[PDB]
Amino acid sequence: KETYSSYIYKVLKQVHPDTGISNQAMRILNSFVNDIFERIATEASKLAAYNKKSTISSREIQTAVRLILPGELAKHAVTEGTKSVTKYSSSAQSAQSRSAKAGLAFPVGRVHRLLRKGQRVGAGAPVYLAAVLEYLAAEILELAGNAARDNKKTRIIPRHLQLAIRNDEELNKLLGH
């Protein structure tokens, strides 16, 4: 039940710089992000155990992503995960934060911690997962903000979220019902 709201907000100002979000709509997105983290992390830990791996690596996160997300969501999420890990590993001499080294707004360190308490976790695994969650947040925010703007509103409200989820076959499969 972690709060990603500040990171969600930053993502919103990138995809829809001129669009607000209501309190309740933010709590709903936050609920979606928490739910998807749980699904992927649990899936990735099982894959590690079932393959006798000691470490949850980025390979397990990737396979779990494809197990949990429907087709086009998974491709794009894998693209974003792979790019973030490639940037991260090329930034090893950087003085910046882990999220900055990955080019991410979502908090890599917190994702690492949450992956550990719920055995070992490679340094690429939280970068990849943070990037997937950031992508899914951006995807939902892009569609929800399009719905608000088409509705002639400058703030995303829960109805805009519901429309965005329902009118997208993949998000409706992932997060509907």
Place this chain on the structure above:
Amino acid sequence: DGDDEEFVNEEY
């Protein structure tokens, strides 16, 4: 904290 109220980012 109202449902319809605009979210204010409490971090910077």
